[model samples]
Target: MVIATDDLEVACPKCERAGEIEGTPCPACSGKGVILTAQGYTLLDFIQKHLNK
Candidate 1:
């Protein structure tokens, strides 16, 4: 399991956008989105499947 420990999604807390790669300032999370989680990754990308299944 590739534990990213970080996920990316829309309304990014950083730049309020998406498609952010590994960077220093993290334009996606903008360092602010660190609180984000697997809500962004697809089932293939995320391991914690099911909403409290």
Candidate 2:
């Protein structure tokens, strides 16, 4: 379960929708939301890395 991504989340590529993007009427998401966690890194670890700033 080591998601390992700095990004909180990204639009579901399958449905191209946000919010309920994790699931709901979509088989990919499974209606359970999504998570990236601190999964991987190569060079820029904190790209944008901002909630507001």
Runs in model 2 deviating more than 4 A are 1-6, 18-24, 32-53
Q: Which 10-residue window of candidate 1 scores lowest in summed lDDT?
A: 1-10
Among these predicted structures, which one has the highest TM-score? Answer: 2
Runs off by more than 4 Å, candidate 1: 1-10, 18-42, 46-53
User: TM-score of the candidate numbered 1?
Assistant: 0.23
lDDT of 2: 0.46
| C-alpha-based local distance difference test score of model 1 | 0.50
Model 2 lDDT tens row, 1-53: 44434354544566655425333565664543343334333223665565356
User: Which prediction has the highest lDDT against the true structure?
Assistant: 1
lDDT of 1 at 34: 47
